[PDB]
Amino acid sequence: YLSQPRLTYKTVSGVNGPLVILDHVKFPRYAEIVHLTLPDGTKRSGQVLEVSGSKAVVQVFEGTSGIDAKKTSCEFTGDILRTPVSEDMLGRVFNGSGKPIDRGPVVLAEDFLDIMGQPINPQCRIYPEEMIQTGISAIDGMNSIARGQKIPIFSAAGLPHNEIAAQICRQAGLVKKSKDVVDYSEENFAIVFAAMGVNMETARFFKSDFEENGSMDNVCLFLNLANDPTIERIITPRLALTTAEFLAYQCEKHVLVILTDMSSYAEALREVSAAREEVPGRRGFPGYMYTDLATIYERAGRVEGRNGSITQIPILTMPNDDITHPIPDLTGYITEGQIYVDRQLHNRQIYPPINVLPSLSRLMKSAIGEGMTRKDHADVSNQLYACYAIGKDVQAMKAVVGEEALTSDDLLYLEFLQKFEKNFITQGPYENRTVYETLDIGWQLLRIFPKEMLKRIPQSTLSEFYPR
Amino acid sequence: YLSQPRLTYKTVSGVNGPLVILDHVKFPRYAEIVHLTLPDGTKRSGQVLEVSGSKAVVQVFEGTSGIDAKKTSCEFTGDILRTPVSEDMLGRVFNGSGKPIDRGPVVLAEDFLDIMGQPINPQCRIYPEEMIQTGISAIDGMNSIARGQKIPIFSAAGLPHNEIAAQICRQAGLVKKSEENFAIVFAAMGVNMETARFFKSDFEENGSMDNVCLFLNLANDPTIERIITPRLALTTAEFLAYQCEKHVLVILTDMSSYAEALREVSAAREEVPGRRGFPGYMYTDLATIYERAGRVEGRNGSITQIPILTMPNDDITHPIPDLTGYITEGQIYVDRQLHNRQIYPPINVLPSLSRLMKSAIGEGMTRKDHADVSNQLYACYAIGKDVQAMKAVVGEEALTSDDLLYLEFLQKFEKNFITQGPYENRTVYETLDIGWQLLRIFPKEMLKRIPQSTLSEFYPR
């Protein structure tokens, strides 16, 4: 460990927006933390990014203002960024920089960890099999998820995704309720939440919701407003992810990370790239943002020899309700699945307006079946899905021509669409439904058709369950 | 007053496109004017655009050609461009750069004014509300233009916008009824000389060439002086308005060529592009061209602009029409479909709009029923167009009586109201009576845009 006095320089050679270029620094370190002292005396921090001979550049996490070519000092610790982390972080609140904001004490660290963390060896990773209860009807049964499974939430401006996040974080539970309840109740879910580029109103809505739940015994909150500087957002997610790693792989608990507004992260990275004059990719975003999103989306899954788990549940906004926009596409190439909250459903006041049609959850493949959830599950979702798609086709054909050309089968499809939207989609504010109930509701929605119409269902299962 | 002898440097360190760089230049004066002596002796001119260190980039009004880095010379004025202004210039003709065309002399220049002009104090503005007599029913009554306003006309190739300009500059008057007259100002913008000849002939047709400040510029002339010409014309208008107590009917033409020249200059200067590749500061440039208008306290004069422009591909979302719409209040939008229907004056009444109804009309000026008549007519025309679109497919059989009434009203509106003719000046009262006669076809019940009192008062005739 380092056992030498710190070092200080004063040669400042320019400021280019959120960057500060400087000269005559001996033996610097790439990715090294720098402190700053202003003429007025305030303190600041930064990160060395570029290095070339004696000249080096940094990035002030809180912007540049009042800096001077000769009346500002800088200090090089000659060490990679080491963050503090303890189990005591539960129940606390902080800003992006990690300093307290809720009047509480300074951080009292249990250990120093690396911001970049480390690349986990894939062989230790245990493939998830548990299927987590969500309470939501659209996610359970149809696009379910697992413990350790990283799923995003696609949404847009003005959509009510915030309370969807509230619901999914509040109604967390396990679906293995068919056994003794006492051993079931031992399990809880530590939550770590990292606001980022989020206005005051949504932040207070979330903290009031958490206070209503009374779950601050196991909630860590990192906060960011709009008025704060922008470059904090470059490092804000990583702090939360590292703390989640420590709370999972060392404290043995089950953690659930929440990330907010990744398009803001992309915007901040693009701003840094615009300052850094590197080669721009499509829509001006740097080429290596793919690898950056990879590095921030891989800290998930459980590991051998332990029993904790890490589930990634980010939310991101699509400008102009676009799907081929860069950030949605690249996130689709990193994350395994999608949800696609839709504006059209929200226009007719259906809450939550979850569009099942473009959704996907690959890891449903082995997360369901006899013993896990129910003998007869997947084909029900497939039949409902194909019926929904064909019903939407019939709806389009009705729009093009009119009800005159529709057959009786088309009428059956249309009433299926109506009932499907009315019952299965619409749930309500705090309607915590069970898995068996949603399966029963699916069977109910299937009942309207006779045996002949269904095509993607085994006849044995139909004879087993349909006649009741 | 400048008792400083002039300078001249031969250090031409380069030429790239329409730009020229001068090294070892001593203490550059920004936004300067310089003169150039070609080796064969021809004179040229330009303005200094950029300065940095002992270097000075300079753009040439007439365009780079023949310049030699070792033989040519350049001399420095030390003052921003100042143009000669004069009240006796009326009845004369000059090119874009201002030199005489009719074998006239160098103008005796009552003063030297800044080409770039100066802004106007906000608090020193007075709102204009006097209605102008145009003689066109589609303007007087629907899109009435008042003094101190800058309505353009959006026209495409082959449209009779030139004749509309002729009519508006010929039948100018005052609605509110000593003598009156409008000091015409006009500058061409590279238009083909046939239109210039037609405008000249019509201006003698007016019979008041003594009040015709004219400027010219043809397509074959250098493109880049088109950036200067309108500013010179506007300076002349400023001088004749706020120094001689005169009203000036400033009119321009073919702003698309101006936009193209500015685009070429910007491309040569590799600035950050915008929509369709246009310059970013095209908006601010257009602002400096247009907002120089109105009338101020302590002066009875006023400035009226009619900057007609070309409209490529008849596309409303094309940037030049869009930005011109933002910077101004009103529009006319002569129609291609009407001209193909063989009707004159072919002005589409619906897309047009004037924002000065708020004070130009009303009781004490024209009448207490002008605004509601116009609103009712607009609504009836729009719904007539909609039912026409419906009839285009549905067929007359499934329609109702209201639909046939609306179609007949539309037919009457087009055959009578719009049809005005080339030399038949009409009064405001006649247009109001014609509109009332048109509206009489509908019974009173379905008139949803007229108050009860006016409807009872005027309808039963």
């Binding site: 004059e277 080669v279 721009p280 001006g284 | 590799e270 950050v272």
Partner: peptide, 18 residues
């Protein structure tokens, strides 16, 4: 195209540092 042109010119002027 404009963005690529700008960065190419930037690289060029950087090349003529000496």
């Amino acid at each position: 195209f404009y963005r690529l042109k700008k960065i190419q010119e930037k690289k060029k002027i950087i090349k003529e540092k000496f």
